């Protein structure tokens, strides 16, 4: 019956962005009221959020993860940067909403929370909604790395290390990306209407 957005937004644990989680939302009635009551980011693309309770979609996805505050702006169509290019990429024609909030109180700890990782290097940009969880050594220079770290040869994931005294641009933010897809197929995820 009611779509389980609470399992996504109020999950006690969130994914590392390089291993970002997707929840598919389907065969359910979607109450979007919680969006209008809190969030530090709430941007939508191609859809008016106050209309969602009167709209139907064929697929709805909720993608979630943790990044730094000053990276939230990269979660938008058209953006570039290590997160948009190497970790989580939206398509140019994204239709949906990007929601984030400061999670310093849960995701940082004294001495540092290193549990959250991101991909610092990649040979090419991700395609939209691509996920890369590989751990090959990254060749930054002319010399082949032969699988071994060294000058110009780097392990590709890095830990954020969130400390509660970080400046707010470096604190952890939880992000949910809602995709509303209107496809050539019956639109069976509707609001109450």
């Amino acid at each position: 019956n009611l779509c389980p957005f609470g399992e996504v937004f109020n999950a006690t644990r969130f994914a590392s962005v390089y291993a970002w989680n997707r929840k598919r939302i389907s065969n359910c009635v979607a109450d979007y009221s919680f969006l209008y009551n809190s969030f530090s980011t709430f941007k939508c693309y191609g859809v008016s959020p106050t209309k969602l309770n009167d709209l139907c979609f064929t697929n709805v996805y909720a993608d979630s993860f943790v990044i730094r505050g000053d990276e939230v702006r990269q979660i938008a169509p058209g953006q570039t940067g290590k997160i948009a290019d190497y970790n989580y990429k939206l398509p140019d024609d994204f239709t949906g909403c990007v929601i984030a909030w400061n999670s310093n109180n849960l995701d940082s700890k004294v001495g540092g929370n290193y549990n959250y990782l991101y991909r610092l290097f990649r040979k090419s940009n991700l395609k939209p909604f691509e996920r890369d969880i590989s751990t090959e050594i990254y060749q930054a220079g002319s010399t082949p790395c032969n699988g071994v770290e060294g000058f110009n040869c780097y392990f590709p994931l890095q830990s954020y290390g969130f400390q509660p005294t970080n400046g707010v641009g470096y604190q952890p933010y939880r992000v949910v990306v809602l995709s509303f897809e209107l496809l050539h197929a019956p639109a069976t995820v509707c609001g109450p209407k």
Partner: nanobody, 121 residues
Framework: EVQLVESGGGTVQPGGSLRLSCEVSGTGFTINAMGWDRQAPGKQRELVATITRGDRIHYADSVKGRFAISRDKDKNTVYLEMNNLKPEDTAVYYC???????????????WGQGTQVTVSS
């Protein structure tokens, strides 16, 4: 969440040493980090030491040089060697694992149940 087993802990004389172990069992998940935090009776939870993907070791300042964390070479267990212990090290120590289901990226992170360490004469 992943299933953890902690061992070690208990009472030790000041200046003595203890070894804690934290094993994550089972399959089907990918590990992002394994480490130890601690929480003293009043204070908030803090890092002690953790090992993240790529064998990167991170220590809290209050233990660097006295504690050593290491990864077992044949199973997913990490060890905390605590040397030269002092009364202020008395705390509940928690195994802290971040991991995700390797097929559907469900977040499986877990705190252990906590193990008391008491440093007193």
């Amino acid at each position: 969440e992943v299933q953890l087993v902690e061992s070690g802990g208990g009472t030790v004389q000041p200046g003595g040493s203890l070894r804690l172990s934290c094993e994550v069992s089972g399959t089907g998940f990918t590990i992002n980090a394994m480490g130890w935090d601690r929480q003293a009776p009043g204070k908030q939870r803090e890092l002690v030491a953790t090992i993240t993907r790529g064998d990167r070791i991170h220590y809290a300042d209050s233990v660097k040089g006295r504690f050593a964390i290491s990864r077992d070479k044949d199973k997913n267990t990490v060890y905390l060697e605590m040397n030269n212990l002092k009364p202020e090290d008395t705390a509940v120590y928690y195994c802290d694992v971040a991991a995700f289901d390797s097929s559907d990226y469900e977040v499986l992170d877990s705190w252990g149940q906590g193990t008391q360490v008491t440093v007193s004469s």
